[PDB]
Coordinates of C-alpha atoms in Angstrom, one line a residue:
Chain C
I1 CA 24.1 26.0 -18.9
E2 CA 25.7 23.2 -21.0
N3 CA 23.5 20.1 -20.6
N4 CA 25.9 17.8 -22.5
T5 CA 28.0 17.7 -19.4
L6 CA 27.1 16.0 -16.1
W7 CA 29.6 16.8 -13.3
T8 CA 30.5 17.7 -9.8
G9 CA 31.6 21.1 -10.9
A10 CA 35.3 22.0 -11.2
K11 CA 37.1 22.1 -7.9
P12 CA 34.2 21.0 -5.6
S13 CA 34.0 21.2 -1.8
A14 CA 34.2 17.9 0.2
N15 CA 31.3 16.0 -1.4
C16 CA 32.4 12.3 -1.0
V17 CA 32.7 9.7 1.7
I18 CA 35.6 7.2 1.5
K19 CA 35.7 6.0 5.1
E20 CA 33.7 2.8 5.9
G21 CA 30.4 3.6 7.6
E22 CA 30.9 7.3 7.5
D23 CA 28.1 9.6 6.4
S24 CA 29.8 13.0 6.3
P25 CA 32.1 14.0 3.4
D26 CA 35.8 13.3 4.0
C27 CA 37.2 14.0 0.5
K28 CA 36.6 15.9 -2.7
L29 CA 35.5 14.0 -5.8
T30 CA 35.8 15.6 -9.2
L31 CA 33.9 13.7 -11.9
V32 CA 33.0 14.9 -15.3
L33 CA 30.7 12.9 -17.7
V34 CA 30.4 14.2 -21.2
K35 CA 28.0 13.0 -23.9
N36 CA 30.0 12.3 -27.0
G37 CA 27.9 10.6 -29.6
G38 CA 27.2 7.0 -28.5
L39 CA 30.0 7.4 -25.8
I40 CA 30.4 9.2 -22.5
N41 CA 33.9 10.7 -22.1
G42 CA 34.7 10.6 -18.4
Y43 CA 37.2 12.5 -16.2
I44 CA 37.7 11.6 -12.5
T45 CA 40.0 12.7 -9.7
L46 CA 40.1 12.5 -5.9
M47 CA 41.5 15.0 -3.3
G48 CA 41.7 14.1 0.4
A49 CA 39.9 16.4 2.9
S50 CA 40.4 14.7 6.3
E51 CA 43.1 13.3 8.6
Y52 CA 41.8 9.9 7.7
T53 CA 42.1 10.2 4.0
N54 CA 45.3 12.2 4.2
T55 CA 46.9 9.4 6.2
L56 CA 45.8 6.5 4.1
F57 CA 49.2 6.6 2.3
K58 CA 51.3 5.9 5.3
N59 CA 50.7 2.3 4.4
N60 CA 52.1 0.5 1.3
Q61 CA 48.9 -1.4 0.4
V62 CA 45.7 0.6 0.1
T63 CA 42.4 0.4 -1.9
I64 CA 40.1 3.3 -2.2
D65 CA 36.5 2.9 -3.3
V66 CA 33.9 5.3 -4.6
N67 CA 30.6 3.7 -5.4
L68 CA 27.9 5.5 -7.4
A69 CA 24.3 4.3 -7.6
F70 CA 21.7 6.1 -9.7
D71 CA 17.9 5.8 -10.0
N72 CA 15.9 5.4 -13.2
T73 CA 16.5 9.0 -14.2
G74 CA 20.2 9.1 -13.7
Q75 CA 20.0 10.9 -10.4
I76 CA 22.5 9.9 -7.6
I77 CA 21.0 7.9 -4.8
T78 CA 23.0 9.4 -1.9
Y79 CA 22.3 6.9 0.9
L80 CA 23.7 4.2 -1.4
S81 CA 26.6 6.2 -2.9
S82 CA 30.0 7.5 -1.7
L83 CA 29.0 10.8 -3.3
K84 CA 26.7 12.8 -1.1
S85 CA 25.6 15.7 -3.4
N86 CA 23.8 15.0 -6.7
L87 CA 25.6 15.8 -9.9
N88 CA 24.2 18.4 -12.3
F89 CA 24.8 20.2 -15.6
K90 CA 27.7 22.5 -16.4
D91 CA 27.1 26.2 -15.6
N92 CA 30.5 27.7 -16.2
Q93 CA 32.8 26.2 -13.5
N94 CA 29.9 25.2 -11.3
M95 CA 27.0 22.7 -11.1
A96 CA 23.8 24.2 -12.6
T97 CA 21.1 24.9 -10.0
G98 CA 17.6 23.4 -10.2
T99 CA 15.9 20.1 -10.7
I100 CA 17.3 17.9 -13.5
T101 CA 14.7 16.1 -15.5
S102 CA 16.6 12.9 -16.3
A103 CA 20.3 12.4 -16.9
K104 CA 19.5 8.9 -18.2
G105 CA 21.5 9.6 -21.3
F106 CA 24.7 9.8 -19.1
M107 CA 24.3 6.4 -17.6
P108 CA 26.3 3.3 -18.6
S109 CA 24.3 1.3 -21.1
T110 CA 22.5 -1.8 -19.7
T111 CA 22.7 -3.4 -23.1
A112 CA 26.5 -3.2 -23.2
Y113 CA 27.1 -3.5 -19.5
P114 CA 24.3 -5.8 -18.0
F115 CA 23.4 -6.4 -14.4
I116 CA 24.1 -9.8 -12.8
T117 CA 21.1 -12.0 -13.4
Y118 CA 22.1 -15.4 -11.9
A119 CA 24.2 -16.8 -9.1
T120 CA 27.5 -17.6 -10.8
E121 CA 27.5 -14.8 -13.5
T122 CA 30.9 -13.1 -13.8
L123 CA 30.1 -10.4 -16.4
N124 CA 33.7 -9.3 -17.0
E125 CA 32.6 -6.9 -19.8
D126 CA 31.4 -4.6 -17.1
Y127 CA 35.0 -3.7 -16.2
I128 CA 37.4 -1.0 -17.3
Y129 CA 41.0 -1.2 -16.1
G130 CA 43.6 1.6 -16.3
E131 CA 46.0 3.7 -14.3
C132 CA 46.7 7.1 -12.6
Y133 CA 49.2 8.4 -10.1
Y134 CA 50.0 9.7 -6.6
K135 CA 52.9 12.1 -6.3
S136 CA 54.6 11.8 -2.9
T137 CA 56.2 14.6 -0.9
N138 CA 59.7 13.8 -2.1
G139 CA 58.5 13.8 -5.7
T140 CA 58.2 10.1 -6.5
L141 CA 55.3 8.8 -8.6
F142 CA 53.4 5.8 -7.2
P143 CA 51.2 4.0 -9.8
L144 CA 47.5 3.5 -8.8
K145 CA 45.6 0.7 -10.5
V146 CA 42.1 1.9 -11.3
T147 CA 39.1 -0.4 -11.8
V148 CA 35.8 0.9 -13.0
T149 CA 32.7 -1.2 -12.7
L150 CA 29.6 -0.4 -14.7
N151 CA 26.1 -1.7 -13.7
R152 CA 27.1 -5.0 -12.4
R153 CA 25.2 -5.2 -9.2
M154 CA 22.0 -3.4 -8.0
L155 CA 21.8 -2.7 -4.3
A156 CA 18.2 -1.6 -3.7
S157 CA 14.9 -1.6 -5.5
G158 CA 15.0 2.0 -6.8
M159 CA 18.4 1.6 -8.3
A160 CA 18.8 1.5 -12.1
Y161 CA 22.5 2.1 -12.7
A162 CA 25.9 1.7 -11.1
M163 CA 29.4 3.1 -11.6
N164 CA 32.2 2.1 -9.2
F165 CA 35.7 3.2 -9.0
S166 CA 38.6 1.8 -7.0
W167 CA 42.2 2.9 -6.9
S168 CA 44.8 0.4 -5.7
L169 CA 48.2 1.2 -4.2
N170 CA 50.5 -1.8 -3.9
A171 CA 54.1 -0.7 -3.4
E172 CA 57.3 -1.7 -1.7
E173 CA 57.1 0.9 1.0
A174 CA 54.6 3.6 2.1
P175 CA 54.6 6.7 -0.1
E176 CA 54.3 9.1 2.9
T177 CA 55.2 9.3 6.6
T178 CA 53.3 12.5 7.4
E179 CA 49.7 13.5 6.9
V180 CA 49.8 14.7 3.3
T181 CA 46.8 15.6 1.1
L182 CA 45.7 12.6 -1.0
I183 CA 45.7 13.5 -4.7
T184 CA 45.0 10.9 -7.4
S185 CA 46.0 12.3 -10.8
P186 CA 43.3 12.5 -13.6
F187 CA 41.9 9.2 -14.8
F188 CA 40.4 9.1 -18.3
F189 CA 37.9 6.6 -19.7
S190 CA 34.9 6.0 -22.0
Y191 CA 31.8 3.8 -22.0
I192 CA 28.8 3.0 -24.3
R193 CA 25.9 5.2 -23.0
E194 CA 22.3 4.4 -22.3
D195 CA 19.7 6.1 -24.5
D196 CA 18.0 9.2 -23.3
Chain S
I1 CA 19.4 8.4 -35.1
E2 CA 22.8 10.0 -34.4
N3 CA 25.2 10.3 -37.4
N4 CA 28.2 11.5 -35.5
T5 CA 28.6 7.9 -34.3
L6 CA 29.8 5.0 -36.6
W7 CA 29.6 1.7 -34.7
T8 CA 29.0 -2.1 -34.6
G9 CA 26.1 -1.4 -32.3
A10 CA 26.2 -2.1 -28.5
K11 CA 26.5 -5.8 -27.7
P12 CA 26.6 -7.3 -31.2
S13 CA 26.2 -10.9 -32.4
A14 CA 29.3 -12.7 -33.6
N15 CA 30.5 -10.5 -36.5
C16 CA 34.2 -10.8 -36.7
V17 CA 36.7 -13.5 -37.7
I18 CA 40.0 -14.0 -35.8
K19 CA 40.9 -17.6 -37.0
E20 CA 43.1 -18.0 -40.1
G21 CA 41.4 -18.3 -43.5
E22 CA 37.9 -18.5 -42.0
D23 CA 34.6 -17.0 -43.3
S24 CA 32.1 -17.6 -40.4
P25 CA 32.2 -15.2 -37.4
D26 CA 34.0 -16.7 -34.4
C27 CA 33.9 -13.6 -32.2
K28 CA 32.0 -10.4 -31.3
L29 CA 33.8 -7.1 -32.0
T30 CA 32.5 -3.9 -30.4
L31 CA 33.9 -0.8 -32.1
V32 CA 32.6 2.8 -31.6
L33 CA 34.0 5.7 -33.6
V34 CA 32.7 9.2 -32.7
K35 CA 33.3 12.4 -34.6
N36 CA 34.7 15.0 -32.2
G37 CA 36.2 18.1 -33.8
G38 CA 39.2 17.2 -35.9
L39 CA 39.4 13.9 -34.0
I40 CA 37.7 10.5 -33.8
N41 CA 37.3 9.2 -30.2
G42 CA 37.4 5.5 -30.3
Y43 CA 36.3 2.5 -28.2
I44 CA 37.0 -1.1 -29.0
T45 CA 36.4 -4.4 -27.2
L46 CA 36.6 -8.1 -28.2
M47 CA 34.5 -11.0 -27.0
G48 CA 35.3 -14.5 -28.3
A49 CA 32.4 -16.7 -29.5
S50 CA 34.0 -20.0 -30.6
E51 CA 36.0 -22.9 -29.1
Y52 CA 39.1 -21.7 -30.9
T53 CA 38.9 -18.1 -29.7
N54 CA 37.8 -19.0 -26.1
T55 CA 40.8 -21.4 -26.0
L56 CA 43.5 -19.1 -27.4
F57 CA 44.4 -18.1 -23.8
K58 CA 45.6 -21.6 -22.8
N59 CA 48.9 -20.4 -24.2
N60 CA 51.1 -17.7 -22.7
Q61 CA 52.1 -15.9 -26.0
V62 CA 49.2 -14.9 -28.2
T63 CA 48.7 -12.2 -30.8
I64 CA 45.2 -11.4 -32.1
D65 CA 44.6 -9.3 -35.2
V66 CA 41.4 -7.6 -36.4
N67 CA 42.0 -5.8 -39.7
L68 CA 39.7 -3.3 -41.2
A69 CA 39.6 -2.2 -44.9
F70 CA 37.3 0.5 -46.2
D71 CA 36.3 1.9 -49.6
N72 CA 36.5 5.5 -50.7
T73 CA 33.3 6.2 -48.9
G74 CA 34.4 4.9 -45.5
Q75 CA 32.3 1.7 -45.9
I76 CA 33.7 -1.7 -44.8
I77 CA 35.0 -4.1 -47.5
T78 CA 34.1 -7.4 -45.9
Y79 CA 36.2 -9.7 -48.0
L80 CA 39.3 -7.7 -47.0
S81 CA 38.4 -7.3 -43.3
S82 CA 38.1 -9.4 -40.2
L83 CA 34.8 -7.6 -39.5
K84 CA 32.2 -9.2 -41.8
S85 CA 29.4 -6.7 -41.7
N86 CA 29.5 -2.9 -42.4
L87 CA 29.4 -0.4 -39.5
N88 CA 26.5 2.1 -39.4
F89 CA 25.3 5.1 -37.5
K90 CA 23.8 5.0 -34.0
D91 CA 20.1 4.3 -33.5
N92 CA 19.7 3.9 -29.7
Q93 CA 21.6 0.7 -28.8
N94 CA 21.7 -0.6 -32.5
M95 CA 23.3 0.0 -35.9
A96 CA 21.0 2.1 -38.0
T97 CA 19.0 0.5 -40.8
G98 CA 19.5 2.1 -44.2
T99 CA 22.1 2.9 -46.8
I100 CA 25.1 5.0 -45.9
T101 CA 25.9 7.8 -48.2
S102 CA 29.6 8.2 -47.2
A103 CA 31.2 7.9 -43.8
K104 CA 34.4 9.2 -45.2
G105 CA 34.7 11.7 -42.3
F106 CA 35.2 8.8 -39.8
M107 CA 38.3 7.6 -41.6
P108 CA 42.0 8.0 -40.5
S109 CA 43.6 11.1 -42.1
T110 CA 45.8 10.1 -45.0
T111 CA 47.5 13.5 -44.6
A112 CA 48.4 12.6 -41.0
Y113 CA 48.6 8.8 -41.4
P114 CA 49.9 8.2 -45.0
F115 CA 50.0 4.9 -46.9
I116 CA 53.3 3.4 -47.8
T117 CA 54.7 4.7 -51.1
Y118 CA 58.1 2.9 -51.4
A119 CA 59.8 -0.3 -50.3
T120 CA 61.8 0.4 -47.2
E121 CA 59.3 3.0 -45.9
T122 CA 58.4 2.7 -42.2
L123 CA 55.8 5.5 -41.6
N124 CA 55.9 5.0 -37.8
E125 CA 53.5 7.9 -37.3
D126 CA 50.8 5.5 -38.4
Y127 CA 51.0 3.5 -35.1
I128 CA 49.1 4.0 -31.7
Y129 CA 50.3 1.8 -28.8
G130 CA 48.4 1.3 -25.7
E131 CA 47.1 -1.3 -23.3
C132 CA 44.0 -3.1 -22.0
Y133 CA 43.5 -6.3 -20.0
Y134 CA 42.2 -9.8 -19.8
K135 CA 40.8 -11.0 -16.4
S136 CA 41.3 -14.7 -15.9
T137 CA 39.1 -17.3 -14.1
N138 CA 41.0 -16.9 -10.8
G139 CA 40.7 -13.1 -11.0
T140 CA 44.2 -12.2 -12.2
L141 CA 44.7 -9.3 -14.6
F142 CA 46.9 -10.0 -17.6
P143 CA 48.1 -7.0 -19.6
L144 CA 47.6 -7.0 -23.4
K145 CA 49.7 -4.7 -25.5
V146 CA 47.5 -3.0 -28.1
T147 CA 48.7 -1.8 -31.4
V148 CA 46.6 0.3 -33.8
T149 CA 47.8 0.7 -37.4
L150 CA 46.2 3.6 -39.3
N151 CA 46.2 3.2 -43.1
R152 CA 49.8 2.5 -44.1
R153 CA 49.4 -0.7 -46.2
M154 CA 46.9 -0.8 -49.0
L155 CA 45.5 -4.2 -50.1
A156 CA 43.1 -3.8 -53.1
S157 CA 42.2 -1.3 -55.8
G158 CA 39.0 -0.3 -54.1
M159 CA 40.5 0.1 -50.7
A160 CA 40.9 3.7 -49.5
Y161 CA 41.5 3.4 -45.8
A162 CA 42.7 0.9 -43.3
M163 CA 42.6 0.4 -39.5
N164 CA 44.2 -2.7 -37.9
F165 CA 44.2 -3.7 -34.3
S166 CA 46.3 -6.3 -32.5
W167 CA 46.2 -7.5 -28.9
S168 CA 49.4 -9.0 -27.7
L169 CA 49.6 -11.4 -24.7
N170 CA 53.0 -12.2 -23.3
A171 CA 52.7 -13.7 -19.8
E172 CA 54.7 -15.9 -17.5
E173 CA 52.2 -18.7 -18.0
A174 CA 48.9 -19.4 -19.6
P175 CA 46.1 -17.3 -18.1
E176 CA 43.7 -20.3 -18.4
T177 CA 43.4 -24.1 -18.5
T178 CA 39.8 -24.2 -19.6
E179 CA 37.7 -22.9 -22.5
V180 CA 36.7 -19.4 -21.2
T181 CA 35.1 -16.6 -23.1
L182 CA 37.8 -14.4 -24.3
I183 CA 37.3 -10.8 -23.1
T184 CA 39.5 -7.7 -23.7
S185 CA 38.8 -4.7 -21.4
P186 CA 37.9 -1.5 -23.2
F187 CA 40.7 0.2 -25.0
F188 CA 40.4 3.9 -25.8
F189 CA 42.2 5.9 -28.5
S190 CA 41.9 8.9 -30.8
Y191 CA 43.2 9.9 -34.3
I192 CA 43.2 12.8 -36.7
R193 CA 40.1 12.3 -38.8
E194 CA 39.8 12.5 -42.6
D195 CA 37.7 15.3 -44.0
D196 CA 34.1 14.7 -44.8
Chain K
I1 CA 36.1 25.8 -40.8
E2 CA 35.6 24.1 -37.4
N3 CA 36.2 26.3 -34.4
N4 CA 35.5 23.6 -31.8
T5 CA 39.0 22.4 -32.7
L6 CA 42.3 24.3 -32.0
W7 CA 45.4 22.8 -33.5
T8 CA 48.8 23.0 -35.2
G9 CA 47.2 21.3 -38.3
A10 CA 47.8 17.7 -39.3
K11 CA 51.4 16.8 -40.3
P12 CA 52.7 20.4 -39.8
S13 CA 56.1 21.7 -40.9
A14 CA 58.9 22.2 -38.3
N15 CA 57.2 24.5 -35.8
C16 CA 58.6 23.6 -32.4
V17 CA 61.9 24.1 -30.6
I18 CA 63.2 21.4 -28.3
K19 CA 66.8 22.7 -27.9
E20 CA 67.9 24.9 -25.0
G21 CA 68.2 28.6 -26.0
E22 CA 67.3 28.0 -29.7
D23 CA 64.8 30.0 -31.7
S24 CA 64.9 28.0 -35.0
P25 CA 62.2 25.2 -35.1
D26 CA 64.0 21.9 -34.9
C27 CA 61.0 19.5 -34.7
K28 CA 57.3 19.0 -35.7
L29 CA 54.7 19.3 -33.0
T30 CA 51.3 17.9 -33.7
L31 CA 48.8 19.1 -31.0
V32 CA 45.0 19.0 -31.3
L33 CA 42.6 20.4 -28.7
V34 CA 38.8 19.8 -29.1
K35 CA 36.0 21.3 -27.0
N36 CA 33.9 18.4 -25.7
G37 CA 31.5 19.8 -23.2
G38 CA 33.2 20.9 -20.0
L39 CA 36.3 19.1 -21.1
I40 CA 39.0 19.5 -23.8
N41 CA 40.0 16.3 -25.5
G42 CA 43.7 16.4 -26.4
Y43 CA 46.0 14.6 -28.8
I44 CA 49.8 15.2 -29.0
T45 CA 52.7 13.8 -30.9
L46 CA 56.3 14.8 -31.8
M47 CA 58.5 14.3 -34.8
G48 CA 62.2 15.1 -35.1
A49 CA 63.2 17.6 -37.8
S50 CA 66.9 18.2 -37.0
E51 CA 70.1 16.3 -36.2
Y52 CA 69.9 17.4 -32.6
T53 CA 66.4 15.9 -31.9
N54 CA 67.1 12.9 -34.0
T55 CA 70.2 12.1 -32.0
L56 CA 68.8 12.4 -28.5
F57 CA 67.8 8.7 -28.2
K58 CA 71.4 7.6 -28.5
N59 CA 71.4 7.9 -24.8
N60 CA 69.6 5.8 -22.2
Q61 CA 68.1 8.7 -20.3
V62 CA 66.4 11.6 -22.0
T63 CA 63.8 14.3 -21.2
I64 CA 62.1 16.4 -23.9
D65 CA 60.2 19.5 -22.8
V66 CA 57.6 21.5 -24.7
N67 CA 56.4 24.5 -22.8
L68 CA 53.3 26.5 -23.8
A69 CA 52.3 29.9 -22.4
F70 CA 49.2 31.7 -23.5
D71 CA 47.7 35.2 -23.1
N72 CA 44.2 36.0 -21.7
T73 CA 42.6 35.1 -25.1
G74 CA 44.3 31.7 -25.5
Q75 CA 46.9 33.0 -28.0
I76 CA 50.4 31.5 -27.8
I77 CA 53.1 33.7 -26.4
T78 CA 55.9 32.6 -28.8
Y79 CA 58.9 34.2 -27.0
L80 CA 57.7 32.3 -23.9
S81 CA 56.7 29.0 -25.6
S82 CA 58.4 26.2 -27.6
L83 CA 55.7 26.4 -30.3
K84 CA 56.8 29.3 -32.5
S85 CA 53.7 29.5 -34.6
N86 CA 50.2 30.2 -33.1
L87 CA 47.5 27.5 -33.2
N88 CA 44.3 28.1 -35.2
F89 CA 40.9 26.6 -35.9
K90 CA 40.4 23.6 -38.1
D91 CA 40.2 24.1 -41.9
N92 CA 40.2 20.6 -43.4
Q93 CA 43.7 19.3 -42.7
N94 CA 45.1 22.8 -42.1
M95 CA 45.1 25.7 -39.7
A96 CA 42.5 28.3 -40.5
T97 CA 43.7 31.7 -41.7
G98 CA 42.9 34.9 -39.8
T99 CA 43.1 36.1 -36.2
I100 CA 41.5 34.0 -33.5
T101 CA 39.4 36.5 -31.5
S102 CA 39.7 34.5 -28.3
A103 CA 40.7 30.8 -27.7
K104 CA 40.1 31.2 -24.0
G105 CA 37.5 28.5 -24.2
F106 CA 40.2 25.9 -25.0
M107 CA 42.4 26.9 -22.1
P108 CA 43.1 24.9 -18.9
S109 CA 40.6 26.0 -16.2
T110 CA 42.2 28.3 -13.6
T111 CA 39.6 27.1 -11.1
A112 CA 40.5 23.4 -11.5
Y113 CA 44.2 24.0 -12.0
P114 CA 45.2 27.2 -10.1
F115 CA 48.4 29.1 -10.3
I116 CA 50.9 29.2 -7.4
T117 CA 50.1 32.0 -4.9
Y118 CA 53.4 31.7 -2.9
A119 CA 56.8 30.0 -2.4
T120 CA 56.4 26.4 -1.1
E121 CA 53.0 25.8 -2.8
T122 CA 52.8 22.4 -4.5
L123 CA 49.5 22.3 -6.3
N124 CA 49.7 18.6 -7.3
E125 CA 46.3 18.7 -9.0
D126 CA 48.0 20.6 -11.8
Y127 CA 49.6 17.4 -13.2
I128 CA 48.5 14.7 -15.5
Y129 CA 50.7 11.6 -15.9
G130 CA 50.5 8.9 -18.6
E131 CA 52.5 7.3 -21.3
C132 CA 53.3 7.0 -25.0
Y133 CA 56.0 5.0 -26.9
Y134 CA 59.0 5.1 -29.2
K135 CA 59.6 2.4 -31.9
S136 CA 63.3 2.0 -32.4
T137 CA 65.1 0.8 -35.5
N138 CA 65.1 -2.9 -34.4
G139 CA 61.4 -2.6 -33.8
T140 CA 61.5 -2.6 -30.0
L141 CA 59.2 -0.3 -28.1
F142 CA 60.4 2.1 -25.4
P143 CA 57.9 3.5 -22.9
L144 CA 58.0 7.3 -22.5
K145 CA 56.6 8.7 -19.3
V146 CA 54.5 11.8 -20.1
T147 CA 53.8 14.6 -17.7
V148 CA 51.4 17.5 -18.5
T149 CA 51.6 20.6 -16.2
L150 CA 48.5 22.8 -16.4
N151 CA 48.9 26.4 -15.5
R152 CA 50.5 26.5 -12.0
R153 CA 53.6 28.7 -12.7
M154 CA 53.2 32.2 -14.1
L155 CA 56.3 33.5 -15.9
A156 CA 55.5 37.0 -17.1
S157 CA 52.8 39.7 -16.7
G158 CA 51.0 38.9 -20.0
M159 CA 50.6 35.2 -19.2
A160 CA 47.3 33.7 -18.2
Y161 CA 47.7 30.0 -18.9
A162 CA 50.3 27.3 -19.3
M163 CA 50.4 23.8 -20.7
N164 CA 53.7 22.1 -20.5
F165 CA 54.6 18.6 -21.8
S166 CA 57.5 16.5 -21.0
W167 CA 58.5 13.1 -22.4
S168 CA 60.8 11.0 -20.3
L169 CA 62.9 8.0 -21.4
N170 CA 64.8 5.9 -19.0
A171 CA 65.7 2.5 -20.4
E172 CA 68.5 -0.1 -19.9
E173 CA 70.4 1.0 -23.0
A174 CA 70.0 3.7 -25.7
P175 CA 67.2 3.0 -28.3
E176 CA 69.5 3.9 -31.2
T177 CA 73.0 4.4 -32.5
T178 CA 72.3 6.3 -35.7
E179 CA 70.5 9.5 -36.3
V180 CA 66.9 8.4 -36.6
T181 CA 63.7 10.4 -36.9
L182 CA 62.3 11.1 -33.4
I183 CA 58.7 10.0 -33.2
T184 CA 56.5 9.8 -30.1
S185 CA 53.3 7.8 -30.4
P186 CA 50.1 9.7 -29.8
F187 CA 49.4 10.7 -26.2
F188 CA 45.8 11.2 -25.2
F189 CA 44.5 13.3 -22.4
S190 CA 41.6 15.5 -21.1
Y191 CA 41.3 18.5 -18.7
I192 CA 38.6 20.7 -17.3
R193 CA 38.3 23.7 -19.6
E194 CA 38.2 27.5 -19.0
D195 CA 34.9 29.2 -19.8
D196 CA 34.7 30.8 -23.3

């Protein structure tokens, strides 16, 4: 058990909900958070697991969202998050088993990335922009604009941290025509971490 | 305290100077350097804190430079740098208090990234090119080409290492029309580190 | 000596072959792999060391390939790879001396990035896409599309892992006219790692 890593395990089963209103997993979310000094080194990827997700790319303009809300101990609050199974430590290629006593040290810092406090506050320092890709059936690479939001809005009283990801597909013509497994290539990023 | 992290602290006060021939801080520079094996994982963000900086983006072609000069012990030499206060180790969300006995290990390898020795010498292995973004008032994302110069040019007799950053804006038209806090989205990078 | 880092050493001597069917190192390959929790933080750069490699960019369309095959203990399989000299632990700015008794812990996870089990199998999760740059003589920058293939294709019985890199240039017109040193700017990446 390596406690310097908070993740979904390598190659996880459907554990994430991307469809609006849905409650049951419709895709596989791979997320790796690693404590690296004052930073967290992150790794994230999405793999479709339903006709809905695997059809999304028959359109030329799509936006996928995965929202993550954590309590005061860095535990995922499922009813508020797209991810339906809590993260855990590294135990080889899987998620360690048992209760985690605080993963606070893995959360985005509230000093560096604050929560909105007043009506018109923009807080643009709470955003990370980047890019990853989708490889279509014929082999073409479609660029996906990625936006990461750290602690900008709280959604309920027991919520202490937030981490949102969104992938944006805005191309000339749809990538696919058939139902093809939705795969976002590895997105890398880092952020100032909260103290333990 | 965590000595594998050399940083400006999370959310620092104005501490950097971007305007020509100035002495007083006109912007907030966040720089995190973490020791990770033979590498340094870096994070850097800029937040303007003056009328001159928060107005730079009323133009479409802007280049911002933040130059860092260090002594033989990896300490900042303020009169040679844009950053006007030495970096220090991590102590929760702050810069540690106390004297630093060498931070040489956080510096750019001179073996990998050499200093210029002759006149027409280019040493292109000293550059790291990447990209980050500025989000305007109306929500549009402007790309900023980031250049990182490792060592290469030496300025004074006491200077042992250098690290220069430059954000380059080259848009169709001016992102802004008003004075808006300049904000560069997190840029990530890595480099071969100097031995301890 | 630091065994949490596996590399070619900083600024190494010609150690890589980019030419078809060749066996004599015609370029310098800088590759650093650091164990960072469940991930491996990577850094990679190339430098021409022959007329062949330093002439390539006299064309507008070029693709450089660096293939890496490893055995069940993370050791390079030279007859199968482009890197003709094994990697080793960190010893200051050099490769440690001696025999690495297993570098499996630095290998691409077979669970996260599986090998093909049949004919028409795609395994698109085995790719990482990104970008680095080339600074020409006139100072202009040319974007190079980078593609990393993790495992996926097995080539011989003694193979257990793969890590191929490919730089792709596709610009209006050739970056050069003269034989100039080939230098790709640092490409950063992470991947889920194989258990020790």
